[PDB]
Amino acid sequence: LSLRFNSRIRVKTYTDELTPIESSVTVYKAANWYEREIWDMFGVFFANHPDLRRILTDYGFEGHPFRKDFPLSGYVELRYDDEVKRV
Amino acid sequence: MLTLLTNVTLASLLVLIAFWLPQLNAYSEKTSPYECGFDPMGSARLPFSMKFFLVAITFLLFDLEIALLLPLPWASQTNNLKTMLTMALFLLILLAASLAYEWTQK
Amino acid sequence: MFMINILSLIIPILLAVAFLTLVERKVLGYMQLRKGPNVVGPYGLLQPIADALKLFTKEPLRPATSSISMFIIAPILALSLALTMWVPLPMPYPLINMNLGVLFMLAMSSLAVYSILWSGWASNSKYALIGALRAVAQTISYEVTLAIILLSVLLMNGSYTLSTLITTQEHIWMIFTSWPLAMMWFISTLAETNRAPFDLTEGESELVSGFNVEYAAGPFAMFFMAEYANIIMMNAFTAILFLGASHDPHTPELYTINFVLKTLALTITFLWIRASYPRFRYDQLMHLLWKSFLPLTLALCMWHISLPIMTASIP
Amino acid sequence: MWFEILPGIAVMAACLFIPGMATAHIHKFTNGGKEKRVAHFSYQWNLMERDRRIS
Amino acid sequence: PAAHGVLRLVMELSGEMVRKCDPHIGLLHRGTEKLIEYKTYLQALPYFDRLDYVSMMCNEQAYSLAVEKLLNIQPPPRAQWIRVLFGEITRLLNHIMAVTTHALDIGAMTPFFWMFEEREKMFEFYERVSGARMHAAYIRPGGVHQDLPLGLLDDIYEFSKNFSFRIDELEEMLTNNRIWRNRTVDIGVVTAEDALNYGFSGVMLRGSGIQWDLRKTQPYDVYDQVEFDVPIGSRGDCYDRYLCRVEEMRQSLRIISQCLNKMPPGEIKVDDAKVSPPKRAEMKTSMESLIHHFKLYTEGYQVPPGATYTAIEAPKGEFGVYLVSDGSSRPYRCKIKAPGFAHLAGLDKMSKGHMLADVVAIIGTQDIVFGEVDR
Amino acid sequence: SRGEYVVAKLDDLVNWARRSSLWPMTFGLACCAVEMMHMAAPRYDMDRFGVVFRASPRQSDVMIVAGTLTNKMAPALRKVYDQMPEPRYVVSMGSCANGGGYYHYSYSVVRGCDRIVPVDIYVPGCPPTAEALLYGILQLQRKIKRE
Amino acid sequence: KGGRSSVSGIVATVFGATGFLGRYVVNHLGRMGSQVIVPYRCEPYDTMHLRPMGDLGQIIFMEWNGKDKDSIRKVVEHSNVVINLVGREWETKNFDFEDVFVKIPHAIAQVSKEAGVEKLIHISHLNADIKSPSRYLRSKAVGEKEVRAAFPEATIIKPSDIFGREDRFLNYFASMRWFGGVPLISLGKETVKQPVYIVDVSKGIINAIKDPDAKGKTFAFVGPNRYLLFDLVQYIFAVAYRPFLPYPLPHFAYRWVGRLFEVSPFEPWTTRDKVERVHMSDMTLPHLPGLEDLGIQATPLELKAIEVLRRHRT
Amino acid sequence: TELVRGLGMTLSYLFREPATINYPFEKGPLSPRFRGEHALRRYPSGEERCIACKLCEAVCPAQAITIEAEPRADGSRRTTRYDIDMTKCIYCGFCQEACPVDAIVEGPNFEFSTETHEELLYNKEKLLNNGDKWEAEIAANIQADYLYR
Numbered sequence A: 001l002s003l004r005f006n007s008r009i010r011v012k013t014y015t016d017e018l019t020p021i022e023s024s025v026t027v028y029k030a031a032n033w034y035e036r037e038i039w040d041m042f043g044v045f046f047a048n049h050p051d052l053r054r055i056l057t058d059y060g061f062e063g064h065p066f067r068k069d070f071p072l073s074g075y076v077e078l079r080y081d082d083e084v085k086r087v
Numbered sequence B: 001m002l003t004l005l006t007n008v009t010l011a012s013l014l015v016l017i018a019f020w021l022p023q024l025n026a027y028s029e030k031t032s033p034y035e036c037g038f039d040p041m042g043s044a045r046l047p048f049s050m051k052f053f054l055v056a057i058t059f060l061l062f063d064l065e066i067a068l069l070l071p072l073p074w075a076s077q078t079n080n081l082k083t084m085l086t087m088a089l090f091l092l093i094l095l096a097a098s099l100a101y102e103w104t105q106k
Numbered sequence C: 001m002f003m004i005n006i007l008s009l010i011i012p013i014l015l016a017v018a019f020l021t022l023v024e025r026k027v028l029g030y031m032q033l034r035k036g037p038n039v040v041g042p043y044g045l046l047q048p049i050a051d052a053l054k055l056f057t058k059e060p061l062r063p064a065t066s067s068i069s070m071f072i073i074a075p076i077l078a079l080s081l082a083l084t085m086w087v088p089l090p091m092p093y094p095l096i097n098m099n100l101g102v103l104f105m106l107a108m109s110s111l112a113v114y115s116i117l118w119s120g121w122a123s124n125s126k127y128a129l130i131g132a133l134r135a136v137a138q139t140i141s142y143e144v145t146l147a148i149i150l151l152s153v154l155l156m157n158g159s160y161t162l163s164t165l166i167t168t169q170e171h172i173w174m175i176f177t178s179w180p181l182a183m184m185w186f187i188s189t190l191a192e193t194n195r196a197p198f199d200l201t202e203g204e205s206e207l208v209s210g211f212n213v214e215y216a217a218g219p220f221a222m223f224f225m226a227e228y229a230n231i232i233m234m235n236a237f238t239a240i241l242f243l244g245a246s247h248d249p250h251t252p253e254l255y256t257i258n259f260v261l262k263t264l265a266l267t268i269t270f271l272w273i274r275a276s277y278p279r280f281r282y283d284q285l286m287h288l289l290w291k292s293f294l295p296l297t298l299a300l301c302m303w304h305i306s307l308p309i310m311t312a313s314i315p
Numbered sequence D: 001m002w003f004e005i006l007p008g009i010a011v012m013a014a015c016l017f018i019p020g021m022a023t024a025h026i027h028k029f030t031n032g033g034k035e036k037r038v039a040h041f042s043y044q045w046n047l048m049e050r051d052r053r054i055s
Numbered sequence E: 001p002a003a004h005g006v007l008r009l010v011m012e013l014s015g016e017m018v019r020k021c022d023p024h025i026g027l028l029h030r031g032t033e034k035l036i037e038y039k040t041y042l043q044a045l046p047y048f049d050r051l052d053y054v055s056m057m058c059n060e061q062a063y064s065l066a067v068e069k070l071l072n073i074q075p076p077p078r079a080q081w082i083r084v085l086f087g088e089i090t091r092l093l094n095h096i097m098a099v100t101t102h103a104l105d106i107g108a109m110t111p112f113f114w115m116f117e118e119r120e121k122m123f124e125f126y127e128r129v130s131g132a133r134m135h136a137a138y139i140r141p142g143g144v145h146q147d148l149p150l151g152l153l154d155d156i157y158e159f160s161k162n163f164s165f166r167i168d169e170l171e172e173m174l175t176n177n178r179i180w181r182n183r184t185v186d187i188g189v190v191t192a193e194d195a196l197n198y199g200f201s202g203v204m205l206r207g208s209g210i211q212w213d214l215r216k217t218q219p220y221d222v223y224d225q226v227e228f229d230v231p232i233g234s235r236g237d238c239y240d241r242y243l244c245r246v247e248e249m250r251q252s253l254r255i256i257s258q259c260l261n262k263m264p265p266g267e268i269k270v271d272d273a274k275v276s277p278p279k280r281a282e283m284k285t286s287m288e289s290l291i292h293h294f295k296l297y298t299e300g301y302q303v304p305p306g307a308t309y310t311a312i313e314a315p316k317g318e319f320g321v322y323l324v325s326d327g328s329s330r331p332y333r334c335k336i337k338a339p340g341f342a343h344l345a346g347l348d349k350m351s352k353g354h355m356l357a358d359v360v361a362i363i364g365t366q367d368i369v370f371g372e373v374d375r
Numbered sequence F: 001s002r003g004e005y006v007v008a009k010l011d012d013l014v015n016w017a018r019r020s021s022l023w024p025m026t027f028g029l030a031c032c033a034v035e036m037m038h039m040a041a042p043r044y045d046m047d048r049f050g051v052v053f054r055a056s057p058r059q060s061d062v063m064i065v066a067g068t069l070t071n072k073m074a075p076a077l078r079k080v081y082d083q084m085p086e087p088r089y090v091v092s093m094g095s096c097a098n099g100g101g102y103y104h105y106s107y108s109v110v111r112g113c114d115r116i117v118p119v120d121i122y123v124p125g126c127p128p129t130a131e132a133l134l135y136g137i138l139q140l141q142r143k144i145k146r147e
Numbered sequence G: 001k002g003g004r005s006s007v008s009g010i011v012a013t014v015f016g017a018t019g020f021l022g023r024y025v026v027n028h029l030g031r032m033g034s035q036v037i038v039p040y041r042c043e044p045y046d047t048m049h050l051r052p053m054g055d056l057g058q059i060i061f062m063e064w065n066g067k068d069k070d071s072i073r074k075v076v077e078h079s080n081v082v083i084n085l086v087g088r089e090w091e092t093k094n095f096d097f098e099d100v101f102v103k104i105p106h107a108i109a110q111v112s113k114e115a116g117v118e119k120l121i122h123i124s125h126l127n128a129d130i131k132s133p134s135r136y137l138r139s140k141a142v143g144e145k146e147v148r149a150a151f152p153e154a155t156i157i158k159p160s161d162i163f164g165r166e167d168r169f170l171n172y173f174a175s176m177r178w179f180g181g182v183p184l185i186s187l188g189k190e191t192v193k194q195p196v197y198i199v200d201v202s203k204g205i206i207n208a209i210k211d212p213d214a215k216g217k218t219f220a221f222v223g224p225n226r227y228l229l230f231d232l233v234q235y236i237f238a239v240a241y242r243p244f245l246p247y248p249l250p251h252f253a254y255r256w257v258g259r260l261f262e263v264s265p266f267e268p269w270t271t272r273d274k275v276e277r278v279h280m281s282d283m284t285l286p287h288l289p290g291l292e293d294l295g296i297q298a299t300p301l302e303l304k305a306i307e308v309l310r311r312h313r314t
Numbered sequence H: 001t002e003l004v005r006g007l008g009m010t011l012s013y014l015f016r017e018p019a020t021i022n023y024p025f026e027k028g029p030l031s032p033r034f035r036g037e038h039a040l041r042r043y044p045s046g047e048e049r050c051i052a053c054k055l056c057e058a059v060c061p062a063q064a065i066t067i068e069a070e071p072r073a074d075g076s077r078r079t080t081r082y083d084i085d086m087t088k089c090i091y092c093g094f095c096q097e098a099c100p101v102d103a104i105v106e107g108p109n110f111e112f113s114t115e116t117h118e119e120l121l122y123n124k125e126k127l128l129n130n131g132d133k134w135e136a137e138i139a140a141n142i143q144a145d146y147l148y149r
């Protein structure tokens, strides 16, 4: 978004499952959270990013969601189990 | 001493009827310390601060001062107030003075 | 039969803290438009005992991490001193004629908060330790100014004995003489008792029920109860000390009939404070004191030292 | 409405009312209407010292 | 209680100062966008109420715009007047909730109860027109659902005339209450440019004095035809943001007047039956009506393939919908901008070295709602 | 003066006691937090029924579970449930956590609230109207009274 | 796949699961997703935590009484298998100590006959073999022999005290610290015992329903090592870290103690019956069908006592 | 000054009449359009309305509904096990809109909180019983509302 000329544009790219595209945090400033987002919602990696790590998930969990494949019901579930007294 | 004893025995009575009454099942993890859900990262250690003693000590040295202020009501009836009155003011000035010195040395 | 007199001092007051709780939810309710407790009463009246029964009936766990001895001894001390401070209080006739019981009121009040320190120390929890610590900060920070202004208002009654403080108020009331000190006494009672704007010990949203957390059923009831003991008690104290009344010895009861009004008139006000102001935060809480209250307490103090000489009006 | 607070508050008063009465009359009950006697100083106690023996 | 039920702000505090707050969102990531993809457009709409749930209408409006652009279709004007009207009542809802609970976090307690009476009277309106007290799936991609009942507008009038005393009395308990001032007046300032780098939105911008505002800037509805004063802040401290909240409440209260005074008769759903389901009296007595009814609910409408980013002035900030029709009746991807997300990202910069209570207040000036953050 | 008579009396006394002033703590996780608050809003005022929201489970008993649950969140929930004093209860609320409700099919939800804690009364809704909630808790008292 | 949603043919009826048994067995049923009909005698409240274990319609509490005949006809009425558990150690008044081990298993057995119940199963302590000390070994021997006489094809559990952290046993001697010392009749080899444990026993029971061969055979469940009682308690306070005081004692006085502590109206910490539970060692007979015959191998106590007793730790 | 001002303000709110309604004994205002418990309902003839066009299944976002129609012996279309589960239903009222014969209806009743999860999962018969309990009431709402539809 540009302010004084109040108008919006939308650049965009493409990426391999494995090629590490660089992080864009420095250029737009408020993109630190997003790098982490897309990293944990996808495989894609951003280079020169200070700290990719999981958000919007459980801890382990592993497989990225939003991979267009990957079942919405996922591969797992928690439940509390009295014999071990733990979820 | 009698009222002290009746008060303390009263309270202790409330304690004993507080524990030896519900008569139910304590067990582990129920008895684990509270930490807003998730378990503690470590037992309580060292919340260190100079900003504690830097003032709290000043508390202690004012409290010693007020300890000297207490005789005043009785001292007021002394036969020779002009001999007294300066001092009655004097300590207060220093009390203030002490504070003043702290006030502005940050 | 002095013992039955003591018992006669201790039962009615506990009843008073219970119904104090209920009044608290009531008035503090109507400030909020919403009615307070009501359905169980008929006028709510039966509530507090149902409440206390709900507590004591409920299981009071002994925490695994806590050392147990301190953890138990603290509540005991809380109710202990909360009640013990009541003894030398002229209504009109003190249960005890201490030569200097005011100073004793300060003594009890000063050992009070120490129980808070243990309450948060043995509780072992992070919130317990942090909240307890800041608690002790605000408390002491207010006891110094507390005791000084109480001194300055006591230079003129004559002496530390309490009954005389009636005699010295056979007309004008102390308050017209030195109200600003009455303000600072009021607020210092508003913080020492750990109340509305000076809210930190409970912490509440700031620290999820503060020091008091790990205590479960009964001990919690004890800290809660003792807290209200101190609130009504400093209120009564202010009442006798800044608001005099007519006293015919032949009909002492008349005086008491007046006195409970004049003190209740104070306690309600705390509640009507509670409904009104956001809490200070631990910086400003101590800022206004050390920076702002205190110097006036001193200047007023020298002033009150100096009136009796200039006015030749020594008590 | 707000007047309905009163049953809650009056119960307070009476409770607090009790000690103030209960002590003041017990004194008269024990002292025979003499309305107790303070003894802040050694001398006044000396008057209660001279007393009791005199009766 | 200050963590709003779903925050885990672990932090390495010193003696009592914070050294760095470390937010961990996702504690309520219900997983929305994956679900949306499997459900047709009309069946996706409720998720949006389930988003910024305090501000339930404006989200719906954001979506219905987001589709109408793809669908190239324009609501009959009356519908636009409702859409703005409830857009504004909702503006008041979020501001009430924001200023209030932000006060409750710092212990004011009372103003809360004084206001939720009113807020309940507003839910009487969602109650009345939508049939639900909240989460009123009422705004439609085609315009609006059922028409609103005749007995309503005077009722809104009677309330709106008297609300101002209430907001005013609130302001008497707060704005002068210098205790409240001292607690929130030097925190937590953000540089006006530095806001822009982090992409702060709505009030978090105006607090630092920058002029920008989407209703004046890139108006989307009858905002062309309403007149109201945007309240710029100055210092960028929580206090200015607060005054912005209040003043924007008053201004919305100005909008309600104008919308009440120019509320044209006409239809409310779009005529295009291919997108808007037929009225019941009609579908039960003519063939095409029943068929388009049937297909609108079975398969649902198709959208031309395409992509877009709409954004509107949701009370917390601009609310942003990026979606891509594949041409099928199930939208392919529907990334949802959450204004709160950026804010909460900017928080730790905004809150270094501040006292631990102040970080609690400053979470509140961020007026964040985690349901929106976790999407 | 049968012992059973006295037992009936004490039964009435403690069960009436506990049922007369229960003290909810609340996971107002999702969006059914707000409806909870309208129970405590003046117009319905939960407090007149004696119930009062007090934080910190150790000082509270019954637990409301408003709003959608999620995976990462669950263990904290089990923690809090364990740290409550007996006689603890809970209350599932809304279509939220009765069983995932709207979000029944996602990787992060944990279906019902039932699958981590032993729920008492259910209060179906989405959100339940605060009043339907009120009927909920009164029903809870009419269940304690049978204890 | 076996799982929480999985069906299985089981329709077990587990009396008295309210105690240390059989929340574990109901669990391992529950991970299978197998239906259960646990019926409560007590109060709903204590039963409440049983609820999660199931999957919506699975677990089904039913009101019953062990004394009414038809009351037990209720919960068996569609059960494919029924599994008795009932047994209070310290003799309640209204349930005289005998019927608990006699009548109830009896009605269970013959009703198991009439309802054509596919399998019946029952528990009795290894020392149930008749002995002058303790009326429980004998009364349980009587109901053992009775159900065997009434439902002969029933397999019968013989577990010499399962080991669990909650356990009413290990926790008990852990809690003997509270009085001061630990009452040993004469220390050392005065008696010697073994523990089956909670999970191993549970897995074994359900495996026993999983075993076609486990018909009328009387299964018995024994700990891997023959721990001496003195060194055992030594290990107890070795893990509880509490001070350890052996407390040698003439045998009669301990029974004077048990008679002293049976007095309490509630649930006494100790009883003369338990006093006879104390000093009598388990028999070492292995030839009976048992735990390993099921194919399950016992989990050693040595790695598992810690979790069991950490709550006692200072 | 302002302190005592605000304090005087809450004094002023003490004297206003309390807003609380006396629930249960009084109950809050609602609307004809309000949504609550579901209930299939009959023709005045006494015949049931539902005809298993099954699109109630096809439009519910939570997909709470499950239907399994089989022919009547008469040969009329009917359900065999219409069912629904309040555990997943979100009370959005799409079903209320969707039905061509206006069979299922989102009933005015809003209170049916219950002890056990298995009760939530309504069977067809349950819905009919709800339709029997309330029919004058529901027909009243729809009578008061349909013109706006």
Ligand SMILES: NC(=O)C1=CN([C@@H]2O[C@H](COP(=O)(O)OP(=O)(O)OC[C@H]3O[C@@H](n4cnc5c(N)ncnc54)[C@H](OP(=O)(O)O)[C@@H]3O)[C@@H](O)[C@H]2O)C=CC1
Binding pocket: G015, G016, G017, G018, G019, G020, G021, G022, G041, G042, G066, G085, G086, G087, G088, G089, G095, G100, G104, G123, G124, G125, G126, G158, G159, G160, G161, G162, G163, G168, G169
């Ligand atoms: N280590 C061990 O504990 C060993 C145990 N065993 C045997 O296996 C069985 C399982 O042991 P465990 O579960 O720990 O014992 P518990 O006491 O824990 O289980 C017995 C349960 O059955 C209930 N019950 C039984 N009969 C009645 C009745 N007539 N009225 C009311 N309630 C009744 C009890 O009370 P309620 O349900 O009413 O609360 C209790 O809940 C026991 O019978 C025991 O003899 C064998 C070897 C070792």
Ligand code: SF4
Binding pocket: E050, E135, F030, F031, F032, F066, F067, F068, F094, F095, F096, F097, F101, F102, F125, F126, F127, F128, H090
């Ligand atoms: S109930 Fe309605 S609001 Fe509460 S979570 Fe489920 S959907 Fe969101």
Ligand code: SF4
Binding pocket: H049, H050, H051, H052, H053, H054, H055, H056, H057, H098, H099, H100, H101, H102, H103, H104
């Ligand atoms: S619409 Fe109503 S009636 Fe027609 S099928 Fe779906 S449910 Fe049965």
Ligand code: SF4
Binding pocket: H059, H060, H061, H062, H063, H064, H065, H088, H089, H090, H091, H092, H093, H094, H095, H096
């Ligand atoms: S209630 Fe709303 S959500 Fe549940 S089925 Fe009927 S329409 Fe679909």
